[PDB]
Design a protein around this ligand. Structure first.
Ligand SMILES: OC[C@H]1O[C@H](O[C@H]2[C@H](O)[C@@H](O)[C@@H](O[C@H]3[C@H](O)[C@@H](O)[C@@H](O[C@H]4[C@H](O)[C@@H](O)[C@@H](O)O[C@@H]4CO)O[C@@H]3CO)O[C@@H]2CO)[C@H](O)[C@@H](O)[C@@H]1O
Length: 461
């Protein structure tokens, strides 16, 4: 990472050109060049490159990713004084507080809304259940009722959660990792309804972000589901649109997962004070946020002074109405595994590779497995010295989850670097492999390391 400049990563659906304008003004005042980038998969690349001390100085994503980054030591603790904290809504700071520390700056609150074409549909439906018949009628004039992105579970979550789906149960001050709601009756009813929409040819399983967007902005579909960032493309299309509350399902509100766009500082950045100055004194001002918002709308901003004006816009009131009905996402490290499991479930059920019941059963099983394995791997790392009696060569015969290639590599590592150094690689390789914990417990018992085996079983439970 280069000292004396700032490199920023933000998602390609956000106003990165407006952000670049804030960076130019920063450069004008400070002499520090700001490069804004929107890499593909930046939220997956970040933890890869940052672990090795590279990456951007500043990373923007919704807050659900940041607990995972913070647990890995990838983020600097942010240090706004009390006066600056006072500028932003307390509930937005709560989104970026992880184990008692502020780990990012909150930018804006995002919730999905129903966006509809007033010329095709002056009175949008209050319920999901009326969408099939509306589509049939619209199909008669060469249009459709509703298209939205079916490739990302974020857009389908509001419907899965409506009748009772949830990610993690919050109870007694904490999210319960072992109480997960993706395979209860409410979750199945929501996904079943979506699957039925597809089975009945009211939607297409491969509709994605760009397909849904093009159709809506060209007047071909009467409704879409999207967030505030999509509004400026609709503005330039001259579709006459409204933004309103999501349709209800089974008489209950759709419950979108609410994201706080947040900006974290790379723990490896040599430019932490400059990054703090940029974020506090340039971005989180009326002018900084205006510049970004004018490019792609941010949603309900964290900055009170600016939000007082945005709150007067019906599209923002609708956003916050949908937010009230949904839930702020957890920022916990288990969030990414939850989302991966739900993505697979929705795509498998929509495409017909699995029934809804198969798809959600696997989502529940596979996410619980992920949480438990990640926790065990984290425990092995923090307690490495407990495991330094483990002899890599002795343990390999009991680890059939390792491929022949894994075994040869580990042998070579052992030859070049010794057993202790190889143990780290052993654990790192195991955790990328299916069913590793059971076999690792077995392998420890096979080597007569019963207390160690029991200690692993205990953490994995
Ligand atoms: O399965 C391979 C795919 O994996 C990658 O996507 C993952 C992410 O890495 C996870 O973080 C998660 O994504 C969440 C996201 O964290 C969450 O904030 C929300 O994202 C919204 C966002 O808040 C909003 O601002 C706007 O940009 O839309 C986003 C959704 O498109 O919801 C996401 C889940 O949909 O899970 C996904 C897996 O779904 C990788 O990037 C993919 O390319 C890859 O196919």
């Amino acid at each position: 990472i280069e000292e004396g400049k700032l490199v920023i990563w933000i998602n390609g659906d956000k106003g990165y050109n407006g952000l670049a304008e804030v960076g130019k003004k920063f450069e004008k005042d400070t002499g520090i060049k700001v490069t804004v980038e929107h890499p593909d998969k930046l939220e997956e690349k970040f933890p890869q490159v940052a672990a090795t001390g590279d990456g951007p100085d500043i990373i923007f994503w919704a807050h659900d990713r940041f607990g995972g980054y913070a647990q890995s030591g990838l983020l600097a603790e942010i240090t706004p004084d009390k006066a600056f904290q006072d500028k932003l809504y307390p509930f937005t700071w709560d989104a970026v507080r992880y184990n008692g520390k502020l780990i990012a700056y909150p930018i804006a609150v995002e919730a999905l809304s129903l966006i509809y074409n007033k010329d095709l549909l002056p009175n949008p439906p209050k319920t999901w259940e009326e969408i099939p018949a509306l589509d049939k009628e619209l199909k008669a004039k060469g249009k459709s009722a509703l298209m939205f992105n079916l490739q990302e579970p974020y857009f389908t979550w509001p419907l899965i959660a409506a009748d009772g789906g949830y990610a993690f149960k919050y109870e007694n001050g904490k999210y319960d990792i072992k109480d997960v709601g993706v395979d209860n009756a409410g979750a199945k009813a929501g996904l079943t309804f979506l699957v039925d929409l597809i089975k009945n040819k009211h939607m297409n399983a491969d509709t994605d972000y760009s397909i849904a967007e093009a159709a809506f902005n060209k007047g071909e579909t009467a409704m879409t589901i999207n967030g505030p960032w999509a509004w400026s493309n609709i503005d330039t299309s001259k579709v006459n649109y409204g933004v309103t509350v999501l349709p209800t399902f089974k008489g209950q509100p759709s419950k979108p997962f609410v994201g706080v766009l947040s900006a974290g500082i790379n723990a490896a950045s040599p430019n932490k004070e400059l990054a703090k100055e940029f974020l506090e004194n340039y971005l989180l001002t009326d002018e900084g946020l205006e510049a970004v918002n004018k490019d792609k709308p941010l949603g309900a901003v964290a900055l009170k002074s600016y939000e007082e004006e945005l709150a007067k816009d019906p599209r923002i009131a609708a956003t916050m109405e949908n937010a009230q009905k949904g839930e702020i996402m957890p920022n916990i490290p288990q969030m990414s595994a939850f989302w991966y499991a739900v993505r697979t479930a929705v795509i498998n059920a929509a495409s017909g590779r699995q029934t809804v019941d198969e798809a959600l059963k696997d989502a529940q099983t596979n996410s619980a497995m992920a949480f438990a394995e990640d926790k065990t791997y984290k425990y092995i790392c923090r307690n490495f010295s407990n495991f330094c009696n483990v002899d890599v060569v002795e343990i390999l015969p009991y680890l059939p989850c390792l491929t022949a290639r894994d075994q040869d590599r580990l042998r070579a590592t052992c030859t070049l670097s010794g057993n202790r150094d190889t143990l780290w690689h052993l654990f790192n390789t195991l955790q990328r492999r299916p069913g590793w914990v059971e076999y690792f417990i077995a392998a420890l018992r096979g080597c007569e390391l019963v207390d160690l085996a029991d200690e692993v079983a205990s953490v994995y439970q």
